[PDB]
Design a protein around this ligand. Structure first.
Ligand SMILES: N[C@@H](Cc1ccc(O)cc1)C(=O)N[C@@H](Cc1ccc(O)cc1)C(=O)O
Ligand SMILES: N[C@@H](Cc1ccc(O)cc1)C(=O)N[C@@H](Cc1ccc(O)cc1)C(=O)O
Lengths: 697, 697
């Protein structure tokens, strides 16, 4: 079924859910801290779920990837080898910034947020500051009890605001990863593709202090005891079976204006794909010369591959469905429908006029901003900017500090500085600086008008770039101890440094703060017009019998439908893959280099009691017509009885343009079957202690 | 069904044909000069069929591509625009070397063949010379009547010989080609692929003189009047329907020795694919710079692309079915079975030992022979060699002239010199000479032992090559009128020439003639051993209840089966594509740039009365489990009643490895539906004159 339904829309999907084959009362799903919805957790960018009373958490391999990478070295490469913790004390910290978010409460604060905004009258900076102060005050009250972290969400272009309260678990440990040739079988070749044969799962365990409250890693921390956990399905999942997903999809753009879509299609997606593909080649070459570079940059390479291939898919998808035509036609239809209301339609038409005027004056600056932005987000330079910014914010009262730099953010900033140790190699960072400066100096003179960067380059050729990278080469910010000393330092200490990366951050900061202020003014201008125009689009869609649900915004959503394939002329994709398909893709070379134990078990048809007689093999991956996007990876796929039949992990090639224009015919979720997860843990990369804890052995 | 069945095996397949749904009696197909088999003609490398009483011939667009290319210029490009001849007088010569072969007679000459070989005694060179003499004598006799071309065919390793006698139509004219965007929709991307959306058809007409006998092109030649021609099918072709194909498969290797397969898999295919891919990039680059190069090298590019991609497909298919294992297992099974047969086994066991002995004599020279062979077959150099060779053979009695250099071959030699005019640009031929010379000079010293080439290079680097290419640029042989003079010149004129290409030819010729004698020796050593060992394999296969049929050898074969798709894990390929499938592949960029009229027609569901209600559209291509290979392109696909339902044109990706090891599961023929052919000539690239001639309007 189309739609990323908020839990508050359960009454509107209760009937469809039952019709599709849900056997739980839709009432049971409305208890968000209950069984089974209370078992679903946010990771921040990924979804997961509790699968044992001792705080065992299951998610995708690609979601645990960052944690696996932090614990990997060139000599002991857990990305390649996998990992298993036979006992609690074998579990590895997933890193200081790893989180498990357990939902505690949702509060609607729409009326209070709208009053905060209205209070600022016609002043857009005051409007931005008023919402910022409201967000901060809601969060501060909601976080007064230790161990909770709150987040304010804006829905439907600012027509609804809800405050979420989570128990914020901060000691997350790696329990189990399959080898990378299972976790990521087919690599970047099969990414965004069906047929799919990827064992995309891994396990964490949540921990808390001995006092029961969230704590950073400590030896005497103990496993979290969740109120609710999911059970692996005992009923074999088949074609046509009801499935549902709860999770945390990040962002969709289905309510974007036509001009927002056209800028993304014509500029953002092709441009990022081009540059990312070039940076990836540079990282791959560096990784061949030094495995330490390969391991340190593996999480960056995986993320950039995934984005660059996604963007290529979206561009092909837009042609497949004529997204530009569809956007143009719907936008024209909304304006005509508003014009038909006369008086009552004028405010939405005015709001549209206002939004339309924001949609440009980027043609001259967008390449500069991309290149300078990327340069500034290289490791040493970005650490310097973050560290200098923090020293500025610390001089203010906490409530006046920039979101991201408040007291509640300090342990996250520090964690970032710590994680950089496992994700930084000076010689690779120098190549990244050189790449992005090269693109900058190639811009026409009118466009290379970053005064500070022009001062530091003193030239616009390869020699000028080499001289600046050579100068920044002298930074001490590669040192974790130096970064942690700068974390505590005052503004004057930064301003006195002869560290070249620090000096660069000090020089660029005034211009960064002004560009940030202009951003907040532009945001404040939209806080009025965006909700009006998006409410009119939603009212129009409702008049056309179209499904009305908010764009994804990182909050909890429910999607549902059934196990089913899809088709193109001459081809029907079947809803399941099987063990034999994994072996048929074997090449003996990454990324089609399955573990020997897998090839041996498939050749022997060692099905481990998990064969689905309807397929004649153990299923591997399955297709369904659910509506998921980035953020949904690791979401539990539940059957009619609320049991875990798999994890969401990807979409097929034709699904990715549904970020902008939903296509029910060719949009499918790709999930890993819970039977494949068990079969891997039985026959290939054994986790006998996990199978015991999951009640599967 | 498996098998490329010779017409003499019709008794064996009589029952299977009936089981599969043939409504004609098998005896009707036994009549080779009768209806429908007498409608089936050879083009020499492609199949075709008569489709009107006025010698209208239908074949694939890729079979007619050479003819279309010959009639194309950068200004008037018939590959791109397509072609239609509204009247007999608008039809264009397909070129001097275009032919239609109409089967006159087949006679078995096995006994005489084997006697001729036995009679030479034991000298390998004598056995070869004796078979050559018998071939020439049987051909000379059979071709004494003015309008006939005959060919001796060796089957099943020399266990059977048959002489084919053909009426040789020497005036073939192009009547109709659709635009290249229909004829070759999807180009090299969709080549060897299902799903397929390619309208791969074109029409010729066969002309004779007013006396009713074959003539070269003349303005007062008239259409041939065939005794039999196929009728387009009136029954709509559906999934599971019986289909059959008669045609002229070139070469299969299913009876190859395990070592012949291992050399092909390990060296021949990967090496040719690598170098052809490199040359194709060069021709693409040169064609982009020069529209005259693009058109002149179109047919060469098309052919090299087809081989390179075929070879990459074969290598993948060998890995899919473990071809290396199957060859090893069969060979070992034959030898073990022969050792159980007592006295009966000893001649075949001894034959095997003789064959095994004369395999690997190449690992040393194979790279050199490939690169020098390719260099020698560049246009100017290859013309120089052929022309000097003819001048040498002319001075011999006809009967002692090398096959291909005899009286009966003169017209074909002269045709090639003329056709070169439309397929040569000096700067492109220089880049081809440079490419292949560059591969030669890269070889280790020990392997670079071509005496003449080393002398002409005077070096072993890019500069040496550039020096020799500069030298050869001096040639006159780029001029058609110069080539045709040399065609009639005697040996002494060649040996007197200071034209650097003639001088190169004169210089290599002694070493070429020795290499050719060593070839005939190697063929002579094999002429008794090969039949003995291949008869044992065939006897062993019969013992195991496997299908026994000869490897393709350019002679007429029958294959049959049913319209059916195929599958692999997660995917089922359906047996038909449809019009909407063509439109869905549209990018407006070559090779997915359909004619505006096709897109308009599809968008408007102008099905021109050709809808199949079971598909809900007009079918485009279809799949069937027939057994075809190179040479079968243009073959008519006949339904249960012997009516034309389409043309064979391709195989799916997994089919190509069946050249070496047949796989019934994933081997399919790809055919263009007779209704798509009608639909294009009605709604897109109109041919109202042909639609009437075919009785479809
Ligand atoms: N494409 C995946 C990431 C991935 C990469 C390589 C693998 O072998 C496996 C997974 C991805 O981005 N998944 C998203 C979820 C998602 C996004 C869009 C659509 O259509 C479906 C799923 C994620 O949250 O990581
Ligand atoms: N691959 C085709 C040629 C072709 C190339 C590009 C197109 O768009 C269409 C056709 C080809 O080589 N066809 C063969 C016939 C054939 C060979 C092997 C198998 O397995 C099936 C058919 C030909 O005779 O030209």
């Amino acid at each position: 079924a189309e739609g990323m339904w908020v839990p508050q829309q359960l009454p509107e999907i209760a009937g469809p859910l039952q019709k599709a084959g849900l056997k739980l009362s839709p009432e049971q799903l409305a208890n968000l801290t209950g069984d089974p919805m209370g078992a679903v957790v946010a990771l921040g960018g990924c979804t997961a779920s509790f699968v044992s009373p001792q705080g065992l958490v299951v998610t995708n391999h690609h979601c645990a990837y960052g944690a696996i990478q932090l614990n990997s070295t060139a000599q002991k490469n857990l990305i390649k080898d996998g990992f298993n913790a036979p006992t609690l004390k074998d579990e590895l910290s997933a890193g200081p910034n790893a989180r498990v978010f357990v939902l505690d409460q949702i509060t609607d604060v729409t009326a209070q947020a709208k009053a905060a905004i209205a209070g600022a009258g016609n002043d857009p900076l005051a409007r931005s500051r008023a919402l910022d102060a409201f967000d901060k005050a809601q969060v501060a009250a909601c976080e007064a009890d230790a161990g909770f972290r709150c987040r304010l969400y804006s829905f439907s272009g600012g027509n609804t605001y809800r405050l979420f309260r989570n128990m914020e678990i901060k000691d997350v440990r790696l329990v189990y990863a399959p080898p990378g040739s299972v976790g990521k079988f087919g690599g970047d070749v099969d990414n965004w593709m069906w047929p799919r044969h990827t064992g995309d799962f891994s396990f964490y365990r949540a921990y808390v202090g001995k006092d029961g409250k969230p704590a950073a890693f400590a030896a005497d921390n103990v496993p979290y005891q969740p109120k609710h956990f999911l059970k692996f399905a005992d009923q074999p999942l088949g074609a046509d079976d009801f499935v549902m997903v709860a999770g945390y999809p990040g962002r969709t753009n289905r309510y974007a204006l036509a001009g927002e879509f056209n800028e993304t299609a014509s500029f953002t997606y092709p441009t990022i794909a081009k540059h990312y593909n070039a940076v990836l080649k540079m990282i791959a070459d560096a990784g061949k010369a030094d495995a330490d570079v390969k391991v340190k940059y593996a999480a960056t390479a995986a993320s950039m591959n995934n984005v660059a291939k996604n963007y290529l898919g979206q561009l092909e998808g837009f042609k497949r469905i004529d997204a530009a035509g569809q956007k143009q036609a719907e936008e024209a239809a909304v304006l005509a429908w508003l014009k038909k209301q006369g008086a009552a339609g004028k405010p939405a038409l005015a709001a549209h006029a206002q939004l339309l005027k924001h949609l440009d004056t980027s043609k001259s600056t967008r390449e500069r901003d991309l290149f300078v932005g990327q340069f500034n987000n290289t490791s040493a330079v970005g650490a310097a900017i973050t560290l200098y910014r923090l020293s500025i914010e610390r001089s203010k009262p906490d409530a006046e500090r920039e979101a991201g730099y408040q007291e509640r953010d300090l342990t996250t900033i520090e964690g970032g500085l710590k994680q950089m140790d496992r994700r930084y190699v000076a010689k690779m960072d120098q190549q990244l600086q050189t790449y992005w400066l090269d693109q900058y100096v190639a811009l026409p003179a009118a466009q290379r008008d970053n005064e500070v960067l022009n001062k530091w380059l003193a030239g616009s050729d390869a020699a000028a770039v080499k001289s600046l990278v050579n100068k920044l080469g002298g930074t001490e910010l590669g040192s974790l101890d130096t970064r942690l000393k700068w974390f505590k330092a005052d503004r004057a200490a930064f301003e006195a440094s002869n560290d070249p990366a620090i000096q660069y951050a000090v020089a660029v900061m005034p211009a960064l703060l002004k560009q940030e202020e202009q951003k907040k003014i532009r945001e404040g201008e939209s806080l009025t017009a965006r909700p009006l125009y998006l409410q009119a689009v939603a009212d129009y869609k409702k008049s056309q019998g179209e499904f009305v649900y908010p764009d994804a915004n990182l909050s909890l959503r429910i999607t549902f439908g059934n196990v089913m394939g899809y088709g193109k002329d001459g081809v029907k994709y079947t809803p399941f893959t099987t063990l034999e398909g994994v072996a048929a893709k074997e090449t003996g070379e990454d990324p089609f280099d399955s573990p020997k134990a897998l090839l041996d078990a498939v050749k022997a048809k060692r099905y481990g009691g998990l064969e689905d007689k309807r397929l004649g093999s153990v299923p591997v991956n399955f297709l369904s017509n659910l509506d998921i996007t980035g953020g949904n990876s690791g979401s539990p796929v539940l059957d009619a009885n609320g049991k875990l039949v798999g994890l969401a992990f990807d979409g097929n090639w034709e699904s990715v343009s549904s970020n902008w224009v939903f296509d029910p015919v060719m949009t499918r979720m790709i999930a890993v079957d819970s039977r494949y997860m068990q079969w891997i843990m039985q026959e290939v990369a054994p986790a006998p202690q996990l199978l015991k804890e999951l009640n599967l052995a």
